[PDB]
Amino acid sequence: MDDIYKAAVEQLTEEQKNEFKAAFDIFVLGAEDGCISTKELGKVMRMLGQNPTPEELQEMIDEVDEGTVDFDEFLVMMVRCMKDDS
Ligand SMILES: [Ca+2]
Ligand SMILES: [Ca+2]
C-alpha cells in the first residue's frame, strides 16, 4: 500500500472497508477485473451515500490515480468525499 493512501484508509473502520468492498464488487467481474471505470466511480460512491460532483470526480482522478480506479484508489476517494458532508 502507498504510505499516503495508507493514512486516508486509516480513517475507515474494518466494517466500513468491508461495506465499501461489497459495493465496489458489484461493478467489476472480480474473477478477472480489479478496476472500475471512471463512470462507475460516481455510481459506487453514490451507492455508498456520497454525492460527488462532476468537477470533483475529475479532480480526484487527476490527484489520486496511480480511465480506471482500483479498490485502494476507490477507498481514498471515498475518504476524501466523506469529508465534504454538510
Ligand atoms: Ca455498518
Ligand atoms: Ca450493507
Number of domains in the chain: 1
Name the residue range of residue 22's domain.
1-86
Grid coordinates representing 32 are 478477472
Question: Resolution in A for the shown PDB structure?
Answer: 1.4
| 11 Cα: distance to centroid of ligand 1 (angstroms) | 14
| 57 Cα: distance to centroid of ligand 1 (angstroms) | 25
| 19 Cα: distance to centroid of ligand 2 (angstroms) | 6
- Ramachandran category for residue 49: left, alpha or beta (phi over 0 → left; psi -120 to 50 → alpha): left
Please state the three-class secondary structure of the chain as a single string. Answer: CCHHHHHHHCCCCHHHHHHHHHHHHHHCCCCCCCEEEHHHHHHHHHHCCCCCCHHHHHHHHHHHCCCEEEHHHHHHHHHHHHCCCC
Grid coordinates representing 81 are 468525499
How far apart are the C-alpha atoms of 12 and 40, rounded to whole Å?
A: 21
How far apart are the C-alpha atoms of 7 and 9, rounded to whole Å?
A: 5
Asked whether 19 and 75 are in contact (CB, 8 A), the reply is: no
- With cell 495508507, the residue in question is 6
How far apart are the C-alpha atoms of 1 and 75, rounded to whole Å?
A: 12
User: Which residues, in sequence order, are CB contacts of 63 under 8 Å at separation 6+?
Assistant: none
What experiment produced this structure?
X-ray
